[PDB]
Amino acid sequence: IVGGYTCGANTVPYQVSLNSGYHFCGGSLINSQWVVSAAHCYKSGIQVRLGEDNINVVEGNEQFISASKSIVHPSYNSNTLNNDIMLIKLKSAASLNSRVASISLPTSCASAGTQCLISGWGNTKSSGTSYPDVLKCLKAPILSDSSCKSAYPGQITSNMFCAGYLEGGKDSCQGDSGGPVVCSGKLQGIVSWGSGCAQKNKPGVYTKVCNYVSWIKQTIASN
Ligand SMILES: [Ca+2]
């Protein structure tokens, strides 16, 4: 997150860190056994780290659980990033408490103008590099289809929305990838892509979770 603030420890209990030796992506816990993240975050040997604030200090609320099964969406295209969504099942169920909590799947897509919480351990600089040890947060609006398709012509599908600030200055960034875009208690988006970070007229593009509820459901049911 560029241009946000420090969330405060455990104030976003559904936020996961994906660790494969180090933090490499965010995710969202959606029930005791499952995490949703972006497909472009796919790796082998993923450890899901729950209840995290400082990803470099053991603070006493963490649960570390290895991935049982990874499932990249059946239609993930990596050149266009269409269908950038992915499920991970946990070797064992997370103990749900107020430091480790799941987020609801949407029942309907948010409209442009809806305000959402985006969070992660991604780069915090628009120029240059700085990765925080603590979870960072940002409140950002959803942008109309029109203005999104104007920022990235020929690049936005009906499985993507833009969210953020066209004047730039505030955005998600690398390392936030795969993490939550939560609007009014529902997971609407997944940090997916964008040209640079917090650049003018290049807002953040997110996977539109409301299209995948069916698939998620479903996949959970038979696995
Ligand atoms: Ca920690």
Domain ranges of the chain: 1-12+103-210, 13-102+211-222
**162: which residues sit within 8 A by CB, 6+ positions away?**
142, 143, 147, 148, 151, 152, 156, 203, 204, 205, 206
Say how many Å lie between the CA of residue 98 and the centre of ligand 1: 16
Give the Cα separation of 172 and 49 in Å (integer). Answer: 20
| CB of 7 closer than 8 Å to CB of 137 | yes
Q: Backbone phi, then psi, for 213, in 5-degree steps? A: -50, -55
DSSP single-letter state for residue 111: P
Question: How many Å lie between the centroid of ligand 1 and the Cα of residue 7?
Answer: 14
Question: Which segments are annotated as binding site for substrate?
Answer: 171-172, 174-175, 177
- Can you read off the two tokens belonging to residue 181? 């875009």
In terms of phi and psi (left: phi > 0; alpha: psi -120 to 50; beta: otherwise), the region of 17 is beta
Same fold, 1-12+103-210 and 13-102+211-222: yes
Annotated binding site for Ca(2+): which residue ranges? 52, 54, 57, 62
Q: Letter for the amino acid at 33?
A: Q
Gap between the Cα atoms of 94 and 47, Å rounded: 13
Residues 6+ apart with CB under 8 A from 214: none
- Cβ-count burial 137-153 (b if 16+ within 10 Å, e if not): bbebbbbeeeebeebbe
- Residue 178: name the closest of 76, 54, 74, 108 by CA: 76
CA–CA dist 39, 19 (Å, integer) = 15
Residue 19 CA, ligand 1 centroid: distance in Å: 12
Alpha-carbon distance of 103 to 213, in angstroms, equals 13
- Nearest Cα neighbor of 92 from 126, 125, 66, 131 is 66
CA of 15 to the centre of ligand 1 (A): 12
In this structure, the number of other CB atoms found within 10 A of the CB of residue 75 comes to 11
CATH fold for domain 13-102+211-222: Thrombin, subunit H (2.40.10)
Strands (E), the chain: 5-6, 15-19, 23-31, 34-37, 47-50, 63-72, 86-90, 115-120, 136-141, 160-163, 180-183, 186-193, 204-208
Q: Would you state the structure tokens that stand for residue 120, as one six-digit string?
A: 């992660």
Q: Which CATH number fits domain 1-12+103-210: 2.40.110.10, 3.10.105.10, 2.40.10.10, 3.60.20.10?
A: 2.40.10.10
* Single-letter amino acid, residue 80: T
Q: Residue positions in the annotated binding site? A: 52, 54, 57, 62, 171-172, 174-175, 177
First to last CA, the chain: 33
User: What backbone torsions phi and psi does residue 27 show, to the nearest 5 degrees?
Assistant: -165, 180
- Cα(86) to ligand 1 centroid in Å equals 24
Residue 51 CA, ligand 1 centroid: distance in Å: 8
Which are the catalytic amino acids?
A: 40, 84, 177
CB neighbourhood size of 47 (10 A): 15
